[PDB]
Design a protein around this ligand. Sequence first.
Ligand SMILES: CCc1c2c(nc3ccc(O)cc13)-c1cc3c(c(=O)n1C2)COC(=O)[C@]3(O)CC
Ligand SMILES: CC(C)CCC[C@@H](C)[C@H]1CC[C@H]2[C@@H]3CC=C4C[C@@H](O)CC[C@]4(C)[C@H]3CC[C@]12C
Ligand SMILES: CC(C)CCC[C@@H](C)[C@H]1CC[C@H]2[C@@H]3CC=C4C[C@@H](O)CC[C@]4(C)[C@H]3CC[C@]12C
Lengths: 566, 566
Amino acid sequence: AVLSFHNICYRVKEILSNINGIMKPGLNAILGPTGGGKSSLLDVLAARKDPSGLSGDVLINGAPRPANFKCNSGYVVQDDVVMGTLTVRENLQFSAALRLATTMTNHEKNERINRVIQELGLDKVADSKVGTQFIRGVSGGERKRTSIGMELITDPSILFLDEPTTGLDSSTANAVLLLLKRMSKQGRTIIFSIHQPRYSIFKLFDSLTLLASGRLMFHGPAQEALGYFESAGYHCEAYNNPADFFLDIINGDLIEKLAEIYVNSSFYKETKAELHQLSGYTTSFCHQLRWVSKRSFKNLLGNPQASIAQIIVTVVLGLVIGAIYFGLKNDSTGIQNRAGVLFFLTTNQCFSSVSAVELFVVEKKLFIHEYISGYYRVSSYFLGKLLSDLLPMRMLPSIIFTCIVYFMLGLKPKADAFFVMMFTLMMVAYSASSMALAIAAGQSVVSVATLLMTICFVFMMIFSGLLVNLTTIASWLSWLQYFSIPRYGFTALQHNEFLGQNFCPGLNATGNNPCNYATCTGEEYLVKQGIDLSPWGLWKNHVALACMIVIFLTIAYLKLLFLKKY
Amino acid sequence: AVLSFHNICYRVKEILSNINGIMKPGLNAILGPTGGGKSSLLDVLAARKDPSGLSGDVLINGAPRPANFKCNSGYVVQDDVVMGTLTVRENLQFSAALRLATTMTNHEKNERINRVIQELGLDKVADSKVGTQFIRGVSGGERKRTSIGMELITDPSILFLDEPTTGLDSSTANAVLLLLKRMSKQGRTIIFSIHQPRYSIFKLFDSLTLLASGRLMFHGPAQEALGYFESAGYHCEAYNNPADFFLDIINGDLIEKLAEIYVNSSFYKETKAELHQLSGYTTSFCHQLRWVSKRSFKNLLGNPQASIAQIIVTVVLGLVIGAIYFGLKNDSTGIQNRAGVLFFLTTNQCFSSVSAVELFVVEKKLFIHEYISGYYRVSSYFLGKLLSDLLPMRMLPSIIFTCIVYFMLGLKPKADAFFVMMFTLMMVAYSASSMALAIAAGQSVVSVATLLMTICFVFMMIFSGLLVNLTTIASWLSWLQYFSIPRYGFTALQHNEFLGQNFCPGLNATGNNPCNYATCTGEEYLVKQGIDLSPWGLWKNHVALACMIVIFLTIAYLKLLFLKKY
Ligand SMILES: CCc1c2c(nc3ccc(O)cc13)-c1cc3c(c(=O)n1C2)COC(=O)[C@]3(O)CC
Ligand SMILES: CC(C)CCC[C@@H](C)[C@H]1CC[C@H]2[C@@H]3CC=C4C[C@@H](O)CC[C@]4(C)[C@H]3CC[C@]12C
Ligand SMILES: CC(C)CCC[C@@H](C)[C@H]1CC[C@H]2[C@@H]3CC=C4C[C@@H](O)CC[C@]4(C)[C@H]3CC[C@]12C
């Protein structure tokens, strides 16, 4: 299975102008600087770029590239897109779990996992965690092998590598490059964009194609490259590295004048003659939903440095709130006291979900690469992570909260009120996380995602039934009370709270009482806040919060789905 | 003026083990990998490392290095430590302004600024801004020249360069390296740690010293380097770069076995013979305070992208608060309304000073390099930046705040109360910025500095006279009300606010009124909050905030002063 390409015109400014040539089923390479069209060529030959600006055709052994070309052809990304806090065994099981289980059994596909672990030579650390900047594990030289080995389980005919020696301890860099020479013995087409090979792997090159500023310099084998520029006009004598002299022509010891000599060279004309003669999902839904939810859950308690950080600051917050309000009295200092704390617990939960923005952006390149390679549909990924790293995570600043705070105060001595308060505190937390997830899903940096959300949770903090008394502002702006998350929190936390008790000792003020502006009963206080006293009015917020969840989640589901993934 | 060095033993593990050798008043170089003792040698030869682990001696032309060796010897740092948003002219004026004005006039030192701009060749873009990742300006090839030219105004005998070709568009890299060859024609000792020269500047090397894993490989001139390893055992034939073959011996095509041949080589023995024969502030305070305050002030409105961002979100916040509370009534819904907003304005100002942590950490390497080179004392830098980027910056979320909010509510229709509220809102803002400055000065990353401070401004948010009613909690924890910034805000903002008005229409409740729990008068409300009613009790917070400022600023002044600056 060979690749070939003819007259590629690519506009965003034409970035890939006049590229054409063939490959060989061996070890191909893309050379040149990073400023040129070197990296942009390999993306278009791997169908990574969009076909909008594409004009030329890529012919694999004469046939055009089919729709599932990206399903069968692995593309190793430049950075470590391996999961850092996972075992290398189950790291390799994951990519095997979504591309292959349509027909074959589990114990049928187990053998090719054990096959690719030995031809990679990765049985040595096969039961170790990979390692990241947070936690250690397997060394960085074998992190690239895990990226390469991950894309070998489904059967490849072409294999791509995006800059495979970017900072790989060059004494260790050669071993993986010999392995690709060892991988090409089966017939794997290895097209990579290598960044400055010195001389060692430069003699083990089967074919090469050097580019500069969007212009083809030269295509040909490495044994034919040394005799080229000596017959072109710039000499490369002794103590002059070949792969670094070939870029010295565009340093200027002009930009197109070197590229013309290749047209009337004895390399390009016979590639045109062979170009002219060749010119004339897969896995079930519930199988996908399990496995991606298995990964992030294992990723969560594989690195429990930021998960248990939220638990401890919650348990210490609840004890501190419990130590502050250790027994709340029904005196005149009750209303300022119990509406104060029940304000605080919602707007904590609305604000402590600032750290829900790091859910789709710390693994965005883990999402774009795994979606476009064909692992799963988007709604499988999105439903997978929510019930794995938003549902069990944001369910315990809530049920851990009430049990440590409601018994240290004695808010309302019941069990339904203990069970409705526990319900709504996890309901705000699911909302304002998703609100923070809505305006942060499908972005690259967390920077403007935190600044935009935090200034949005201030206007929600104002309209919350505490700092305003919403009934008193004018109706041309009091419509903004509905566009606020913790108001639905604070109302629901108050409606189950002011129902039977009297903040008026020594007197009773039900219907016959003089001397108003008293606010003795809480039901008198609630109409000062204008809260309706119906039992519908309690659950009116929860459906309003539940419909706040759905519109915020599907706009996040839209934003990942309509993401420019090329 | 030549440098020499003998038997350097350096422990943190011995990192610089057995280094010795001489220099030449020309162009010296330090070679090897980044993993070795290459970068750590140049720091010790520039007196950048601490002399704690140092054992050997560095002899400059036989004399030991004096105390003000660092005053006369420039050290160019690896990254661009030039000020990005400043003009190249005034960028070069700055370093001239602090090292030279002790005797000579301003118009005497102006000539050497015009002298070093032409021998650098930087008159072409001399009136342009430098440029950063935020705003453009002079291209990145001439950013390194501005770092080099900055350390030339005071007269150098030795000049250091920390890795001067780290990503400098290698076609442009040669021009600055020829300039150092052109600079060495005067007699400037140029010792740099160059990272992988290919061949071009490798022939323009006067002396070189290659190191590996803390072991000296070889010291000598570049013309004597090519004949070394051919007479040592590993051959470097044609199409083999010399500077990359010299590191290939430690790749292994062992770690000390190559380093032994240098001991019985004809290079080291005659350097020992010459080593054995050589073996036997400045500127006023107020002149320093002006110039550093001129720099950051010019840096502030040189990049007014984040300065005017805070102004607009302030003016839009004040209009929104003004639109919400457009006329606050003296009904029963006054106390919840006016204590609500006056809670919000303090805890905004306490929280909106989260962005004061980026004051000593976005330019920390701009501080360590400029302190140790001898530009100023620390208290000059610390008093310089506060009245330039904390005092005029955090004075206008306050006086811009009251004028847009006090007239849209009519809080207390006076002019003293307008002038005490404007005073205290800038007093909280100066406090909680410095509180955020205290636990962030002298750190490298803003990450744990934001997480620690924001969870600290929650416990200050609770004990604030709103969510607690501080008089009702037990005295074993109510001592924590004093360790909270905006309580002093909220009390002082309330004491000038509840003094003459009555939230009790149709009745008067001064001393003769039945039907308690009424809170008609505000002075009755203040003793429900337990605020003392003395006019001392108003200003009691401001001195408590002013003494909060001093202890937080001098712990920041201590933290910069006792910083490990080696
Ligand atoms: C409810 C406690 C609470 C708050 C904030 N953050 C938290 C974070 C974690 C946590 O557990 C509890 C938090 C926060 C932030 C800000 C303001 C504010 O009132 N609060 C309150 C005012 O407005 C601002 O600009 C902003 O600084 C936004 C950055
Ligand atoms: C795109 C973003 C802003 C959508 C915001 C969602 C909010 C504004 C929408 C979604 C669901 C809606 C709520 C669902 C139904 C009810 C119950 C009714 O008795 C009061 C209005 C109320 C509470 C609606 C108010 C507006 C609402 C809360
Ligand atoms: C190291 C950090 C925690 C220091 C914190 C500064 C605070 C806690 C210190 C510094 C200055 C001190 C205040 C200065 C004087 C007064 C006025 C007095 O009538 C009440 C106590 C009060 C208000 C002090 C309380 C404690 C205080 C506020």
